[PDB]
Design a binder for this molecule. Structure first.
Ligand SMILES: c1cnc(N2CC[C@@]3(CCOC3)C2)cn1
Length: 167
């Protein structure tokens, strides 16, 4: 059972124009088996477009590569991101938590996706009653990107709806 290829891909932005298929592969093979690795180039000049893609054999290998950031590739710090499902944010909306879900429920669950900086459990402006949704802010976008591709999120026995949240 192979994970869908789309979930095993990293877009790599900010490449040095001297990075090649081969040097990008040599770099990112340190964190897993690469089934594909390409530098995007102009069709006429062959000059690099400054970005590429790598595809790992498993999602755990994608995780390993993201956890090894920052990546300096051929002398330049590059910008890896998981393929789109890019709206790059650090904050999620968590809905369906009802009125019994507390901060530690959200923290104990979401801390395994990334480092949490803010948890905001929403309350009614007039009564102070919990409204049944929350916002979690992380220190980095990959946490959110991992979270929103999951089909399900179970927190405090609730099946939650989780979406990217923007400013
Ligand atoms: C994260 C960030 N960017 C991504 N894009 C994919 C290729 C792109 C669209 C067409 O040309 C450039 C940019 C994907 N995932």
């Amino acid at each position: 059972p192979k994970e869908p290829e789309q979930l095993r891909k990293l877009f790599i932005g900010g490449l040095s124009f001297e990075t090649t298929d081969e040097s990008l592969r040599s770099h990112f093979e340190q964190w897993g088996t690469l089934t594909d690795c390409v530098v995007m180039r102009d069709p006429n000049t062959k000059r690099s477009r400054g970005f590429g893609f790598v595809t790992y054999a498993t999602v755990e290998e994608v995780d390993a590569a993201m956890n090894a950031r920052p990546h300096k590739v051929d002398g330049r710090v590059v910008e890896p991101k998981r393929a789109v499902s890019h709206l790059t944010v650090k904050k999620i909306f968590v809905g369906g938590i009802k009125e019994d879900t507390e901060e530690h429920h959200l923290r104990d669950y979401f801390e395994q996706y990334g480092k949490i900086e803010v948890i905001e459990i929403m309350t009614d402006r007039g009564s102070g009653k919990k409204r049944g949704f929350a916002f979690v802010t992380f220190d980095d976008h990959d946490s959110v990107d991992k979270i929103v591709i999951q089909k399900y999120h179970t927190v405090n026995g609730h099946n939650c709806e989780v979406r990217k949240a923007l400013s």
